[PDB]
Design an enzyme around this catalytic site. Structure first.
Site, PDB file in Angstrom:
ATOM      1  N   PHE A   9      -8.327  -6.505   3.869  1.00 62.57           N
ATOM      2  CA  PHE A   9      -7.958  -5.118   4.064  1.00 62.57           C
ATOM      3  C   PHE A   9      -8.227  -4.265   2.778  1.00 62.57           C
ATOM      4  O   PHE A   9      -8.695  -3.147   2.803  1.00 62.57           O
ATOM      5  CB  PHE A   9      -6.437  -5.119   4.286  1.00 62.57           C
ATOM      6  CG  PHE A   9      -5.875  -3.767   4.622  1.00 62.57           C
ATOM      7  CD1 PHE A   9      -5.760  -3.334   5.940  1.00 62.57           C
ATOM      8  CD2 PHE A   9      -5.423  -2.919   3.617  1.00 62.57           C
ATOM      9  CE1 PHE A   9      -5.192  -2.108   6.278  1.00 62.57           C
ATOM     10  CE2 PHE A   9      -4.842  -1.695   3.940  1.00 62.57           C
ATOM     11  CZ  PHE A   9      -4.748  -1.267   5.264  1.00 62.57           C
TER      12      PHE A   9
ATOM     13  N   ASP B 265      -6.602   6.707  -5.048  1.00 63.26           N
ATOM     14  CA  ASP B 265      -6.237   5.360  -5.293  1.00 63.26           C
ATOM     15  C   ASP B 265      -6.479   4.967  -6.709  1.00 63.26           C
ATOM     16  O   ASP B 265      -6.953   5.741  -7.518  1.00 63.26           O
ATOM     17  CB  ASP B 265      -6.758   4.370  -4.238  1.00 63.26           C
ATOM     18  CG  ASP B 265      -8.211   3.978  -4.245  1.00 63.26           C
ATOM     19  OD1 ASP B 265      -8.802   3.911  -5.432  1.00 63.26           O
ATOM     20  OD2 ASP B 265      -8.747   3.655  -3.209  1.00 63.26           O
TER      21      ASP B 265
ATOM     22  N   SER C 201     -13.131 -19.763  -4.990  1.00 66.39           N
ATOM     23  CA  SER C 201     -11.753 -19.706  -4.548  1.00 66.39           C
ATOM     24  C   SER C 201     -11.711 -20.147  -3.102  1.00 66.39           C
ATOM     25  O   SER C 201     -10.798 -20.884  -2.750  1.00 66.39           O
ATOM     26  CB  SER C 201     -11.097 -18.307  -4.640  1.00 66.39           C
ATOM     27  OG  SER C 201     -11.227 -17.786  -5.933  1.00 66.39           O
TER      28      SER C 201
ATOM     29  N   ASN D 235      -8.058 -19.399 -10.216  1.00 63.43           N
ATOM     30  CA  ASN D 235      -9.372 -18.798 -10.090  1.00 63.43           C
ATOM     31  C   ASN D 235      -9.307 -17.379  -9.513  1.00 63.43           C
ATOM     32  O   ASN D 235     -10.123 -16.506  -9.764  1.00 63.43           O
ATOM     33  CB  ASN D 235     -10.286 -19.721  -9.227  1.00 63.43           C
ATOM     34  CG  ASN D 235     -11.686 -19.201  -8.965  1.00 63.43           C
ATOM     35  OD1 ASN D 235     -11.967 -18.412  -8.020  1.00 63.43           O
ATOM     36  ND2 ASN D 235     -12.573 -19.618  -9.832  1.00 63.43           N
TER      37      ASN D 235
ATOM     38  N   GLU E 292       0.781  -1.188   0.000  1.00 61.14           N
ATOM     39  CA  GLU E 292       0.000   0.000   0.000  1.00 61.14           C
ATOM     40  C   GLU E 292       0.821   1.249   0.000  1.00 61.14           C
ATOM     41  O   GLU E 292       0.316   2.266  -0.401  1.00 61.14           O
ATOM     42  CB  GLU E 292      -0.875   0.046   1.280  1.00 61.14           C
ATOM     43  CG  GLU E 292      -1.902  -1.089   1.428  1.00 61.14           C
ATOM     44  CD  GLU E 292      -3.039  -1.050   0.435  1.00 61.14           C
ATOM     45  OE1 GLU E 292      -3.203   0.114  -0.131  1.00 61.14           O
ATOM     46  OE2 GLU E 292      -3.724  -2.014   0.175  1.00 61.14           O
TER      47      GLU E 292
ATOM     48  N   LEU F 130      -8.796   4.013   3.106  1.00 57.89           N
ATOM     49  CA  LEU F 130      -9.856   4.627   2.285  1.00 57.89           C
ATOM     50  C   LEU F 130     -10.637   5.689   3.067  1.00 57.89           C
ATOM     51  O   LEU F 130     -11.189   5.436   4.130  1.00 57.89           O
ATOM     52  CB  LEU F 130     -10.855   3.607   1.749  1.00 57.89           C
ATOM     53  CG  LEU F 130     -11.971   4.268   0.939  1.00 57.89           C
ATOM     54  CD1 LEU F 130     -11.397   4.865  -0.335  1.00 57.89           C
ATOM     55  CD2 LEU F 130     -12.994   3.226   0.540  1.00 57.89           C
TER      56      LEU F 130
END
Ligand code: CL
Ligand code: CL
Length: 162
Positions: A104, A20, A117, A132, A11, A32
């Site tokens: 996250f 972003d 998945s 996948n 990040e 965010l």
């Protein structure tokens, strides 16, 4: 290597509101702020989050405080989630980190949605799960980060971050 270091690599660290990949107002370590086009709505959220009048700028310590809260919230969301909890209980420590990474980034609801998945992770069918997971918007939008996360999930090692 641990989840904190892993996420900080993925990040970055930014002390000033920014956008972003998606276009949202973000700050610090992947925190965010708002999906709203208003920079003023961002600044308001930020001051609220920090408890002070920031003018869209924070210190490293503040970004770390947010980061600590966000990782904790990620972990807790996993454990409180009926779809997520079992997958996590079934995984080794490295792979657990991978799922926390995803949560996250894309939220609990987002990840919980990866039905197939998740079912492959639990069945410890690693290659297939990796294939996948690559069939997603996530992967197409942030391919290098995603590859890293997918390799971690597939291998159970921290190579991609080394
Ligand atoms: Cl917050
Ligand atoms: Cl990327």
């Amino acid at each position: 290597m641990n989840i904190f270091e892993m996420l900080r690599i993925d990040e970055g660290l930014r002390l000033k509101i920014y956008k972003d990949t998606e276009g949202y107002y973000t700050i610090g370590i992947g925190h965010l702020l708002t999906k709203s086009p208003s920079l003023n709505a961002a600044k308001s959220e930020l001051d609220k989050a920090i408890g002070r009048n920031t003018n869209g700028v924070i210190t490293k310590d503040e970004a770390e405080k947010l980061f600590n809260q966000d990782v904790d919230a990620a972990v807790r969301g996993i454990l409180r989630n009926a779809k997520l909890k079992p997958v996590y209980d079934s995984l080794d420590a490295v792979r657990r980190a991978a799922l926390i990474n995803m949560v996250f980034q894309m939220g609990e609801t987002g990840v919980a949605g990866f039905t197939n998945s998740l079912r492959m992770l639990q069945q410890k069918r690693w290659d297939e799960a990796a294939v996948n997971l690559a069939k997603s918007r996530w992967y197409n939008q942030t391919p290098n980060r995603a590859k890293r996360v997918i390799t971690t999930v597939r291998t159970g090692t921290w190579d991609a971050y080394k």
